[PDB]
Amino acid sequence: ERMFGTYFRVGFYGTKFGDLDEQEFVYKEPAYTKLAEISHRLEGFYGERFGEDVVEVIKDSNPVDKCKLDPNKAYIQITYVEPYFDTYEMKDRITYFDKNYNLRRFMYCTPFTLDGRAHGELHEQFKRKTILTTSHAFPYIKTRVNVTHKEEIILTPIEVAIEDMQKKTQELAFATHQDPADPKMLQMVLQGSVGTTVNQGPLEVAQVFLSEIPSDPKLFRHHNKLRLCFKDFTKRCEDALRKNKSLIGPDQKEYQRELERNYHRLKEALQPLIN
Amino acid sequence: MQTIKCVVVGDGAVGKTCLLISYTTNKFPSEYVPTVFDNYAVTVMIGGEPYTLGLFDTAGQEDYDRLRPLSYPQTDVFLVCFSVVSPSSFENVKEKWVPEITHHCPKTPFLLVGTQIDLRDDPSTIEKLAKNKQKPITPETAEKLARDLKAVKYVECSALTQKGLKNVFDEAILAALE
């Protein structure tokens, strides 16, 4: 999705920035520009000018509260962002060939707990989807254009579980139905879905959320959706498993055997909570 | 061409995963949206051409000694990882990790990645480890370890100050193309 190019929010905090102080841009970089790159540059450029030791870089994304900030120092907050679309805006970016034409909304996610931590347990994890609206729109005459409005949305931890599941259900879905196939990308997605070794695995998600049928049916429209997303997930793992059996040679036969074994072990456990 | 299989091995709590998820998502280690699944994909540009790098994340526990080398076949390049302020983990590079990937994959290139290098030049951890008779790993004492071990080279980075982060992955791709 860098047919569109790479976009970061940039906030300028400090009197030493002259007219930039309390202004906030969305920068447009070339495609696949990495967070290291821009942050090297903006610190490098205000290093050369104010002195290396006053350029402090806000390695954050929570909105800047003006107080906590040493007023002597020059603070730059940098956050990667993605172009944000209507469901109507998006649909038309499917069917007509030119798609880079009204980029004025940009989205970032920042994770939290009520605790004031960034990350928590599966049931403690919150996410704030923020939508930035810029004054003018890309593509534009300048490469940065500043932010005029801002919208925050909050996802209850179960809504967060859903977005995690949906993205990886689709990551499988894509790595399966694609020509010519990519076996390494497919096994990479597949193993990290059914045969996880490091993170929490998808089972613990069903367990933490799908174990009790909630009363409050405003929360039921959540419980159900996660229940159905596991159904689509478990259908896309099969398909992917099947498809990897085609693509492998002899060396990866024990590999696939374990990936298979890992799956039925999981669908086993899943089935109580899904049905 | 196609995806590059890069398998990443090393002790848990060198923050091996912490940096995989943060480079690939363009996030600081404080703001990445955490997940439950494993492995991460990323497109790096290199000489104007864009290569995609499949990042295979592996538990550093003994408990997985039996299962882990199942990912090793068809690997293109290895990132062997240690934290420069965890000399337990830099010993497990000589005598666990590099032997393991070179036993199943003798012709496959690997890299030495030091990580968490911000805590090296950090006052509170230096004498914290010295207060059990240990100094962090200087790049000197790691650069030779990699020449000793016929690694492609040594690289070190910080997930947090992003320093040398891009270099780690540029070299991994490059090493896969030779």
Side-chain angles (χ1 to χ4, degrees):
Chain A
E1 205 198 39
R2 299 164 208 163
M3 66 174 303
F4 292 103
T6 303
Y7 301 84
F8 305 84
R9 175 262 305 282
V10 178
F12 289 98
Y13 291 77
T15 309
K16 302 188 146 48
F17 286 124
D19 291 277
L20 286 155
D21 190 35
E22 274 204 2
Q23 282 185 349
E24 205 192 46
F25 302 80
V26 166
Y27 273 57
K28 175 180 181 164
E29 298 298 285
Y32 312 112
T33 319
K34 293 302 139 201
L35 173 65
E37 266 159 312
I38 186 173
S39 195
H40 185 71
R41 170 167 109 247
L42 294 194
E43 174 163 15
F45 178 75
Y46 293 96
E48 290 165 355
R49 182 184 289 180
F50 299 7
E52 288 187 341
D53 42 318
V54 201
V55 200
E56 290 313 328
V57 186
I58 300 185
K59 320 222 169 86
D60 197 356
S61 49
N62 285 280
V64 198
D65 204 4
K66 260 290 204 167
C67 65
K68 288 180 182 173
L69 329 171
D70 173 13
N72 164 44
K73 286 194 167 195
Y75 288 146
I76 324 178
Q77 175 193 29
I78 320 181
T79 290
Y80 174 78
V81 302
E82 272 184 343
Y84 187 90
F85 288 137
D86 296 6
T87 49
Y88 291 85
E89 288 182 342
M90 265 185 104
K91 269 210 191 174
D92 277 9
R93 313 289 158 119
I94 296 185
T95 77
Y96 176 82
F97 83 88
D98 174 45
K99 318 179 203 280
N100 193 21
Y101 65 79
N102 185 44
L103 301 207
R104 62 184 284 120
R105 280 225 275 184
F106 299 82
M107 197 281 320
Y108 67 114
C109 293
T110 72
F112 64 97
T113 63
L114 308 191
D115 214 343
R117 295 158 302 170
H119 308 104
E121 291 310 333
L122 259 187
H123 66 79
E124 283 174 352
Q125 201 55 64
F126 279 83
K127 187 158 97 177
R128 182 183 50 253
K129 290 208 302 168
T130 320
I131 291 169
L132 313 192
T133 323
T134 65
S135 76
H136 305 138
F138 288 111
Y140 184 46
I141 188 43
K142 294 153 187 150
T143 67
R144 69 195 194 194
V145 57
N146 35 47
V147 200
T148 176
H149 296 109
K150 164 174 293 189
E151 330 158 43
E152 277 168 44
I153 277 185
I154 281 197
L155 277 58
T156 67
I158 188 185
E159 310 178 84
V160 172
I162 293 188
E163 274 193 359
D164 198 2
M165 290 291 304
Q166 296 193 302
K167 165 153 57 202
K168 179 76 52 166
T169 295
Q170 228 294 316
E171 193 172 344
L172 291 161
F174 170 91
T176 305
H177 295 57
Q178 75 144 352
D179 257 324
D182 204 331
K184 295 180 200 171
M185 185 52 61
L186 167 65
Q187 306 150 12
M188 201 215 47
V189 179
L190 191 56
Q191 152 195 333
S193 312
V194 304
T196 67
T197 60
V198 159
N199 269 287
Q200 304 130 77
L203 213 173
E204 197 154 48
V205 188
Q207 293 186 206
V208 172
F209 300 87
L210 303 181
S211 290
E212 313 185 347
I213 277 176
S215 300
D216 179 8
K218 271 194 172 303
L219 283 54
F220 211 99
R221 274 225 192 109
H222 287 342
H223 180 283
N224 205 41
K225 196 188 205 204
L226 179 59
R227 194 186 58 82
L228 294 192
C229 284
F230 265 90
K231 265 189 178 183
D232 255 31
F233 175 77
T234 203
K235 290 181 190 164
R236 293 299 85 68
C237 290
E238 211 163 293
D239 294 352
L241 261 170
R242 209 168 276 125
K243 183 84 198 298
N244 203 43
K245 226 176 164 53
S246 315
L247 308 159
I248 51 172
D251 56 350
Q252 290 183 320
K253 274 180 59 183
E254 214 192 325
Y255 184 38
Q256 166 94 4
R257 182 181 289 116
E258 171 69 7
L259 297 186
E260 296 185 15
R261 193 182 294 278
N262 275 336
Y263 167 71
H264 316 80
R265 199 173 277 114
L266 155 61
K267 183 188 185 72
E268 194 73 13
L270 266 185
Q271 163 165 0
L273 298 120
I274 315 304
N275 311 132
Chain B
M1 51 164 51
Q2 256 173 5
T3 290
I4 299 189
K5 182 175 197 180
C6 175
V7 187
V8 176
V9 306
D11 300 347
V14 304
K16 176 185 71 284
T17 299
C18 177
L19 82 83
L20 290 181
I21 186 165
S22 297
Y23 181 67
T24 51
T25 59
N26 286 304
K27 290 291 175 187
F28 285 113
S30 324
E31 53 161 337
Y32 69 82
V33 200
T35 188
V36 302
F37 297 91
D38 275 318
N39 306 333
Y40 320 94
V42 51
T43 299
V44 169
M45 292 226 67
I46 298 182
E49 306 271 335
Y51 305 83
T52 303
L53 190 64
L55 292 179
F56 292 77
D57 195 4
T58 73
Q61 287 55 45
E62 271 71 1
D63 305 285
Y64 296 80
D65 288 1
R66 292 183 184 175
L67 285 193
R68 162 176 56 250
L70 289 190
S71 312
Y72 296 6
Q74 295 282 344
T75 295
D76 294 309
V77 72
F78 282 103
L79 296 182
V80 182
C81 290
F82 76 86
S83 168
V84 284
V85 296
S86 175
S88 98
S89 64
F90 186 43
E91 278 304 327
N92 292 116
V93 176
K94 309 176 187 187
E95 63 177 3
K96 183 167 177 56
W97 291 123
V98 186
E100 195 184 88
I101 71 190
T102 51
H103 168 241
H104 304 79
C105 289
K107 319 163 187 171
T108 282
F110 76 102
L111 261 66
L112 260 81
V113 188
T115 54
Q116 288 177 339
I117 78 171
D118 42 314
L119 322 189
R120 200 195 278 127
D121 291 346
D122 157 44
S124 68
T125 299
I126 304 207
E127 230 70 48
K128 202 171 189 178
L129 321 185
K131 278 160 222 316
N132 313 98
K133 313 287 175 204
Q134 293 187 92
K135 56 179 88 181
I137 306 308
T138 78
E140 282 74 55
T141 59
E143 283 178 16
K144 202 207 177 183
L145 191 272
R147 184 181 55 91
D148 297 330
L149 293 182
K150 290 316 169 211
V152 180
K153 58 167 63 179
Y154 174 72
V155 301
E156 60 178 53
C157 56
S158 174
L160 182 48
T161 86
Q162 295 284 311
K163 184 183 203 293
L165 202 50
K166 179 172 146 289
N167 184 77
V168 170
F169 299 94
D170 288 11
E171 300 282 345
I173 293 189
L174 289 164
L177 319 178
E178 201 50 32

